[PDB]
Amino acid sequence: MILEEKDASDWIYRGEGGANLVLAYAGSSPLFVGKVIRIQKARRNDSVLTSDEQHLWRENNELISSPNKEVLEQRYVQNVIIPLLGPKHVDAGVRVSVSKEFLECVDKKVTKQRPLWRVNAANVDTSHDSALILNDHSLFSQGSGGDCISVEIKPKCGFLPTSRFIGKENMLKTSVSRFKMHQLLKLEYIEISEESEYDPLDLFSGSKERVLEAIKALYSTPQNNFRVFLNGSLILGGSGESTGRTSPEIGYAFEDALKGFIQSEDGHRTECFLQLVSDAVYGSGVLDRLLEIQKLDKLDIEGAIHCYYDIINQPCPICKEELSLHALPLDESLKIVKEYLIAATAKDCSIMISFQSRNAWDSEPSGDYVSLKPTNQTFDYKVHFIDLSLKPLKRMESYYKLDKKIISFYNRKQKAE
Numbered sequence: 450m451i452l453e454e455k456d457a458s459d460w461i462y463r464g465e466g467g468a469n470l471v472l473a474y475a476g477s478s479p480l481f482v483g484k485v486i487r488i489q490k491a492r493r494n495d496s497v498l499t500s501d502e503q504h505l506w507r508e509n510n511e512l513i514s515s516p517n518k519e520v521l522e523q524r525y526v527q528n529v530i531i532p533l534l535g536p537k538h539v540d541a542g543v544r545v546s547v548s549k550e551f552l553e554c555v556d557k558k559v560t561k562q563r564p565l566w567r568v569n570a571a572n573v574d575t576s577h578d579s580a581l582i583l584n585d586h587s588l589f590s591q592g593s594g595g596d597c598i599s600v601e602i603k604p605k606c607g608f609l610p611t612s613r614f615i616g617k618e619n620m621l622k623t624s625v626s627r628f629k630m631h632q633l634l635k636l637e638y639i640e641i642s643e644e645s646e647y648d649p650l651d652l653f654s655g656s657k658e659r660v661l662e663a664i665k666a667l668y669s670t671p672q673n674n675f676r677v678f679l680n681g682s683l684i685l686g687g688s689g690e691s692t693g694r695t696s697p698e699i700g701y702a703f704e705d706a707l708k709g710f711i712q713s714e715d716g717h718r719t720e721c722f723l724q725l726v727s728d729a730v731y732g733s734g735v736l737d738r739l740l741e742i743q744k745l746d747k748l749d750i751e752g753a754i755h756c757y758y759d760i761i762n763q764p765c766p767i768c769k770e771e772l773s774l775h776a777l778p779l780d781e782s783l784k785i786v787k788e789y790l791i792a793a794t795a796k797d798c799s800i801m802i803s804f805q806s807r808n809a810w811d812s813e814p815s816g817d818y819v820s821l822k823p824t825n826q827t828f829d830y831k832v833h834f835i836d837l838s839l840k841p842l843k844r845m846e847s848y849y850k851l852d853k854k855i856i857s858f859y860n861r862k863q864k865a866e
């Protein structure tokens with residue numbers, strides 16, 4: 450019911466993004482075995498919903514009357530995302546009461562395993578009385594079948610905008626993925642050391658060869674897009690952050706960690722694992738439905754931003770001294786922006802794919818598996834989406850400014866012919 454200070458020692462750092470700290474359970478309590486706990490951070494840059502937001506999510510009443518942010522996320526996923534992605538690959542999570550000292554002790558306990566820059570930016574909001582308990586998707590099933598190799602992919606946006614509302618100076622956005630353009634900026638801002646090889650357009654292409662190309666690229670330059678876990682412990686990718694190119698040292702360590710699981714010859718396990726992930730992702734069709742949601746961003750931020758100012762009743766600062774978008778009835782403007790924010794969730798979520806050697810003694814043999822040609826192995830697999838966070842309405846403003854910054858920096862770098 451309530452987590453207490455002394456329970457803190459049973460949770461171990463697992464990872465974090467910009468919004469949450471995620472800890473894996475290491476204790477014995479049948480309650481938490483196979484779970485992770487997801488804990489919101491307080492951003493130092495930064496009651497449950499602004500007035501404009503309650504206006505935005507008016508169709509979803511349970512969601513507007515959430516007594517806290519944990520319940521908000523919980524109801525968002527259950528009532529808005531599920532009906533869109535299906536419930537098979539999604540877990541809304543169960544709330545659990547936490548005491549202030551539990552939070553404080555956890556924050557202090559994991560501090561040293563956290564990236565320095567993540568610590569500078571945010572800490573566990575010790576003013577929340579609740580956290581989220583999720584199933585740990587590095588564990589094959591809730592409640593064994595041997596080891597479990599788990600892969601996390603954060604696919605980003607897999608389509609190009611085609612908007613009538615993209616300015617003349619910015620048409621490159623029509624040609625070059627946002628992920629690719631953003632790479633140049635990050636490099637310029639010293640957030641990464643080398644541009645990623647990953648092309649979201651390949652992963653979402655629907656082509657088996659191109660999906661494998663994406664997976665191979667993810668492997669070489671994982672950044673914050675790719676991680677691999679062996680029974681819940683990280684063996685490739687960054688811990689709470691983006692990581693650098695895969696070096697020979699990293700390649701070897703990863704190759705070794707796969708022994709027994711991928712039953713190929715020493716030195717060849719890695720290529721076999723990459724083929725296995727590719728088959729799993731491609732065969733599950735799971736990316737197609739995600740892409741559909743991402744494409745709820747129909748007009749691009751350059752279009753959607755106009756509706757946003759209408760929704761909040763401010764004169765549009767983007768138009769200066771569109772006859773089209775600003776002539777929309779409140780109802781359509783709210784729809785457009787709400788879908789833009791749902792798309793933003795889909796653009797930033799992750800997929801975790803759990804693998805385990807196919808178990809002949811399952812009482813109902815899974816329909817979902819992949820046959821590895823050479824090794825003569827069959828693996829059952831499961832896919833779950835994670836990090837299906839609700840994006841705050843106010844973020845429409847920085848989405849526009851970030852976008853403007855990406856395209857103009859890219860334009861400038863290109864003009865440097």
Ligand SMILES: O=P(O)(O)O[C@H]1[C@H](OP(=O)(O)O)[C@@H](OP(=O)(O)O)[C@H](OP(=O)(O)O)[C@@H](OP(=O)(O)O)[C@H]1OP(=O)(O)O
Nearest residue numbers: 465466467468469631673690691793797798836838840844
């Ligand atoms: O902190 P980072 O690892 O650099 O990742 C952030 C972070 O995503 P995660 O927290 O899921 O990792 C942002 O989300 P917030 O935590 O700030 O809510 C997200 O911003 P949006 O989802 O609001 O877009 C942003 O995505 P983007 O840069 O595409 O806007 C993304 O950065 P990456 O570009 O590295 O994924």
Ligand SMILES: Nc1ncnc2c1ncn2[C@@H]1O[C@H](COP(=O)(O)OP(=O)(O)O)[C@@H](O)[C@H]1O
Nearest residue numbers: 464465466467468469471583584585586835836
């Ligand atoms: N249900 C889960 N099972 C296993 N790992 C998880 C789960 N939820 C989160 N994680 C791990 O913790 C990391 C951070 O979680 P996430 O919800 O993406 O945080 P943020 O909201 O800050 O982006 C994820 O990238 C993933 O590696």
Ligand SMILES: [Mg+2]
Nearest residue numbers: 466467797836
């Ligand atoms: Mg995340």
Ligand SMILES: [Mg+2]
Nearest residue numbers: 466468836838
């Ligand atoms: Mg998030």
Ligand SMILES: [Zn+2]
Nearest residue numbers: 755765767768
């Ligand atoms: Zn306008």
